[PDB]
């Protein structure tokens, strides 16, 4: 099983602190952003997964041992933190999970979608 | 002397990757420009650069010493690899160097742009 984890609308946050020239906030945000996907990698791995990328906003991820899913995105979203929150989509190839990854970014996002469950 | 520096079509490889589902190609990718942003910090600190973040693919920092800015950038135009270029903007704080930033993105990429000079 393959899982994308993307963060949403990371960019307003980050272009906002350039154009209002708060360079702390930026700071803050991007090291924030660092740390988040480092929880989040941390807490997959405790579950079997091996780590594919955990870098910038993102961490993808698979498992070839069996996991449950509302477990580990309802720990997902409980790295929220000041209104940025995580969209997950989960396929059984990387490409399945970058698929529902989109539909998930494009369907309120703070929400996984599972590749399998869309084709029907 | 604000400087902001981004990866260009950075997407494009990675989406690749997703699509064709090539994960060591898509990590490949992911710890490459997690690497090449460390070259471009470490080189920015060398010429008495602070950095603000260095994360995902790209790198911000300020300078209150002075700088030659065409070596800056003929060096970060020289960490390209496989097809994935730099662009850069520069100003006089943060807003400024975001703008021009957008500029070199909107006018072929692999490219510095200059707030001041954008203006005039
Ligand atoms: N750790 C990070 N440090 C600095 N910039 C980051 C980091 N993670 C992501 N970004 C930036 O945030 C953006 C991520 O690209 P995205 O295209 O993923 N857009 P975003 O608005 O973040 O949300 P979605 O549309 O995916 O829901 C780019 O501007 C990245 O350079
Ligand atoms: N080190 C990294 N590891 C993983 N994904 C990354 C990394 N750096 C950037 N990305 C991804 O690449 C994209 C960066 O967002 P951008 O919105 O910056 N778009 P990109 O096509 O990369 O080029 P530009 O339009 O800026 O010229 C997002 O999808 C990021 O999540
Ligand atoms: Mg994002
Ligand atoms: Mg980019």
Redo the contacts with the bound molecule.
Sequence with gaps: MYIAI??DD??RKITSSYLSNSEERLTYISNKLNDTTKKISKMLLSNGFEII?Q????VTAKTDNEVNLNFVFDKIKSYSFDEITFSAGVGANLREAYVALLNSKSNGKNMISIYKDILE
Aim: glycine share 34%.
């Design positions: 993307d963060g990371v960019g990328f870098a910038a906003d993102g």
